[PDB]
Design a protein around this motif. Structure first.
Motif, PDB file in Angstrom:
ATOM      1  N   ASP C   1       0.855  -1.217   0.000  1.00  0.00           N
ATOM      2  CA  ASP C   1       0.000   0.000   0.000  1.00  0.00           C
ATOM      3  C   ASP C   1       0.880   1.252   0.000  1.00  0.00           C
ATOM      4  N   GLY C   2       2.143   1.126   0.413  1.00  0.00           N
ATOM      5  CA  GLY C   2       3.022   2.304   0.548  1.00  0.00           C
ATOM      6  C   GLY C   2       3.471   2.915  -0.762  1.00  0.00           C
ATOM      7  N   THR C   3       4.004   4.135  -0.705  1.00  0.00           N
ATOM      8  CA  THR C   3       4.520   4.809  -1.883  1.00  0.00           C
ATOM      9  C   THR C   3       6.000   4.514  -2.073  1.00  0.00           C
ATOM     10  N   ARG C   4       6.380   4.164  -3.311  1.00  0.00           N
ATOM     11  CA  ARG C   4       7.757   3.879  -3.632  1.00  0.00           C
ATOM     12  C   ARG C   4       8.241   4.743  -4.783  1.00  0.00           C
ATOM     13  N   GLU C   5       9.561   4.963  -4.801  1.00  0.00           N
ATOM     14  CA  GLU C   5      10.248   5.714  -5.837  1.00  0.00           C
ATOM     15  C   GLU C   5      11.153   4.744  -6.574  1.00  0.00           C
ATOM     16  N   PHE C   6      11.493   5.044  -7.826  1.00  0.00           N
ATOM     17  CA  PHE C   6      12.321   4.153  -8.623  1.00  0.00           C
ATOM     18  C   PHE C   6      13.783   4.583  -8.561  1.00  0.00           C
ATOM     19  N   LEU C   7      14.656   3.610  -8.259  1.00  0.00           N
ATOM     20  CA  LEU C   7      16.089   3.831  -8.237  1.00  0.00           C
ATOM     21  C   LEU C   7      16.752   2.799  -9.137  1.00  0.00           C
ATOM     22  N   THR C   8      17.933   3.162  -9.654  1.00  0.00           N
ATOM     23  CA  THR C   8      18.731   2.247 -10.449  1.00  0.00           C
ATOM     24  C   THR C   8      20.181   2.314  -9.986  1.00  0.00           C
TER      25      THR C   8
ATOM     26  N   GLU D   6       9.404  13.149 -10.590  1.00  0.00           N
ATOM     27  CA  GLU D   6      10.007  11.903 -10.147  1.00  0.00           C
ATOM     28  C   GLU D   6       8.978  10.801 -10.324  1.00  0.00           C
ATOM     29  N   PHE D   7       9.427   9.552 -10.499  1.00  0.00           N
ATOM     30  CA  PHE D   7       8.503   8.446 -10.728  1.00  0.00           C
ATOM     31  C   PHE D   7       8.230   7.708  -9.425  1.00  0.00           C
ATOM     32  N   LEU D   8       6.943   7.516  -9.125  1.00  0.00           N
ATOM     33  CA  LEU D   8       6.511   6.813  -7.931  1.00  0.00           C
ATOM     34  C   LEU D   8       5.551   5.705  -8.350  1.00  0.00           C
ATOM     35  N   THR D   9       5.480   4.652  -7.530  1.00  0.00           N
ATOM     36  CA  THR D   9       4.527   3.581  -7.734  1.00  0.00           C
ATOM     37  C   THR D   9       3.861   3.239  -6.410  1.00  0.00           C
ATOM     38  N   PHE D  10       2.567   2.912  -6.503  1.00  0.00           N
ATOM     39  CA  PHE D  10       1.804   2.388  -5.385  1.00  0.00           C
ATOM     40  C   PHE D  10       0.652   1.543  -5.925  1.00  0.00           C
ATOM     41  N   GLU D  11       0.115   0.697  -5.035  1.00  0.00           N
ATOM     42  CA  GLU D  11      -1.040  -0.137  -5.318  1.00  0.00           C
ATOM     43  C   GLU D  11      -2.284   0.510  -4.717  1.00  0.00           C
ATOM     44  N   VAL D  12      -3.361   0.550  -5.500  1.00  0.00           N
ATOM     45  CA  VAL D  12      -4.640   1.061  -5.034  1.00  0.00           C
ATOM     46  C   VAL D  12      -5.645  -0.092  -5.003  1.00  0.00           C
ATOM     47  N   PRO D  13      -6.214  -0.433  -3.823  1.00  0.00           N
ATOM     48  CA  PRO D  13      -7.243  -1.474  -3.730  1.00  0.00           C
ATOM     49  C   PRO D  13      -8.617  -1.030  -4.231  1.00  0.00           C
ATOM     50  N   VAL D  54      -3.727  14.994  -7.377  1.00  0.00           N
ATOM     51  CA  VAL D  54      -4.044  15.803  -8.536  1.00  0.00           C
ATOM     52  C   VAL D  54      -2.745  16.274  -9.170  1.00  0.00           C
ATOM     53  N   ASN D  55      -2.726  16.255 -10.505  1.00  0.00           N
ATOM     54  CA  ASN D  55      -1.622  16.716 -11.329  1.00  0.00           C
ATOM     55  C   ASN D  55      -0.516  15.656 -11.450  1.00  0.00           C
ATOM     56  N   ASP D  56      -0.685  14.498 -10.791  1.00  0.00           N
ATOM     57  CA  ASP D  56       0.139  13.346 -11.090  1.00  0.00           C
ATOM     58  C   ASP D  56      -0.062  12.953 -12.556  1.00  0.00           C
ATOM     59  N   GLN D  57       1.029  12.660 -13.247  1.00  0.00           N
ATOM     60  CA  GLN D  57       0.971  12.141 -14.598  1.00  0.00           C
ATOM     61  C   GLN D  57       0.923  10.624 -14.516  1.00  0.00           C
ATOM     62  N   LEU D  58      -0.028  10.001 -15.225  1.00  0.00           N
ATOM     63  CA  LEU D  58      -0.124   8.552 -15.265  1.00  0.00           C
ATOM     64  C   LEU D  58       0.883   8.059 -16.284  1.00  0.00           C
ATOM     65  N   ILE D  59       1.745   7.151 -15.827  1.00  0.00           N
ATOM     66  CA  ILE D  59       2.861   6.650 -16.613  1.00  0.00           C
ATOM     67  C   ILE D  59       2.613   5.192 -17.004  1.00  0.00           C
ATOM     68  N   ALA D  60       1.983   4.404 -16.128  1.00  0.00           N
ATOM     69  CA  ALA D  60       1.795   2.986 -16.368  1.00  0.00           C
ATOM     70  C   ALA D  60       0.732   2.408 -15.439  1.00  0.00           C
ATOM     71  N   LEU D  88      -0.269   1.492  -9.973  1.00  0.00           N
ATOM     72  CA  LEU D  88      -0.006   2.728 -10.694  1.00  0.00           C
ATOM     73  C   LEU D  88       1.476   3.068 -10.663  1.00  0.00           C
ATOM     74  N   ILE D  89       1.957   3.628 -11.774  1.00  0.00           N
ATOM     75  CA  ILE D  89       3.207   4.366 -11.814  1.00  0.00           C
ATOM     76  C   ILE D  89       2.860   5.783 -12.248  1.00  0.00           C
ATOM     77  N   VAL D  90       3.234   6.760 -11.406  1.00  0.00           N
ATOM     78  CA  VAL D  90       2.941   8.145 -11.688  1.00  0.00           C
ATOM     79  C   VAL D  90       4.239   8.930 -11.729  1.00  0.00           C
TER      80      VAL D  90
END
Lengths: 97, 7, 95, 95, 7, 88, 4, 96, 99, 6, 5, 7
Positions: C1-8, D6-13, D54-60, D88-90
């Motif tokens: 459920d948490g927010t993650r950022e992408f690293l390489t 910056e790119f972030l990912t999270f799961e939405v139930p 709001v204003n998050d760009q949907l990436i994937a 989501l990836i935003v």
């Protein structure tokens, strides 16, 4: 350097020839990607201000440079820039301070 | 040997 | 459920990574969550390198994404990508 | 034209979504910019989850990129990818 | 779900 | 390295350099090793790999050693080039 | 090899 | 003799170069013309190398120009530049 | 210069002051000095009689003295200076387009 | 006319 | 400057 | 304006 990078994206406008940067492949021992080597002052990238030296180029208008080798990646980049013959979406990887 | 470009 | 950022980062090459990874699933939402680093084996390539961290989600290996698939397939893709320096993309919590 | 993201990912139930998204375009550079979160409906799955903004760009979406596409195609891909839990990836502004 | 040690 | 003819051309700029790497070589001269794609030289199209650099805006090299010549070149950075190019 |  | 000439350069490996050279002068017009290859000794370094030709004007030797000088000074400069196994010549050769 | 150019050299004879019998112009970048170029060749002039010099030739050197590192003004000066003979003959080096 | 060998 | 010479 | 609500 072989450290930790995060992904950033920004849009760079054109038509003020190109981005106005030099890029170089990196390799080590046994490769690493395409990196911004220098930013030409007065160039589109310079005016825009957000791109930095040592940024790794990850994608250009959605065309990834990952998975490729430096040769292929460089090719893909040049191809993706022949837009004209005015806005590039860059994805870069930048080292965490 | 080297590998460099301008874009 | 948490927010993650992408690293390489790049990990040099026990001519493997030296990590255990586990799939995560949500019970209630009947849904695979991804593959996550469970442990990083001391002395391993990952340990020496120091950048990979427990609970990192593995997102891509040498450009080969692990995302658009299920834990089983993703795990497979990962093993496959190691048989043939690894470039990792991970997702790491900010939460 | 302005903004680093910056790119972030999270799961939405889901109640196993409550969001409006809009295309953005640049007048003067004749260019589609992407799909952006316009609003979050209160009480929606997204609202309950709290991470999307709001204003998050949907990436994937569940591994399906929206990136190389145009606003129309991207929107399509997104709706299609909705057929338990959405990954989501935003891309979110930091500057 | 499964765990795989990658030695 | 065979017989060479002398050619001269003007190369425009703007900012960025010429966009080439050069290499030395008993001491011979400075030679174009590569031309960086997109660079001023590349856009202009006339300079070629293995061209010997002979003069820059009227400043000869030649008489010099590779070290001094390289220096003179860097110092001297629209450029008027004189090169020597093989025919045989 | 040196850049110019 | 001088006609219209183009500049060529080549390196000649190496007794010396194995050529005789002569100053040319215009009697009327009171003018030194330069140093020119008069003959090429068979078996000499220049002969083996094959690029240098009779009536070529010597323009420079290992980067030391002979232009601007008079025939005597130029000849001197040439001999000097030969004392101190690779000679870089610049010659001027007729195209018309 | 104006194109890709080659270097040529020839001797031009003179007479009892007359000069080459040509007009030359300094050329400059619209958007840097480029050199001295033959603009016209006056019929009956020394250069005309000799027949080798051509319009648009860049003057590179005179009796061995280069014009290249100089600016158009200085170069022009050097050229005029190199003409007197207190009989006479100028050794020219020119740069002429091949493409 | 100072013919030399060189 | 266009000059005779 | 190409909007896509999800309700």
């Amino acid at each position: 350097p072989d450290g930790t990078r995060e992904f950033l994206t920004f849009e760079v406008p054109l038509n003020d020839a190109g981005l106005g940067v030099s890029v170089k492949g990196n390799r080590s021992k046994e490769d690493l990607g395409i990196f911004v080597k220098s930013i030409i002052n007065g160039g589109a990238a310079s005016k825009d201000g957000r791109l930095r030296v040592n940024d790794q180029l990850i994608a250009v208008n959605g065309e990834s440079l990952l998975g490729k080798a430096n040769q292929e990646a460089m090719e893909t980049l040049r191809r993706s820039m022949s837009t004209e013959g005015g806005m590039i979406q860059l994805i870069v990887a930048r080292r965490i301070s | 040997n080297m590998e460099e470009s301008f874009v």
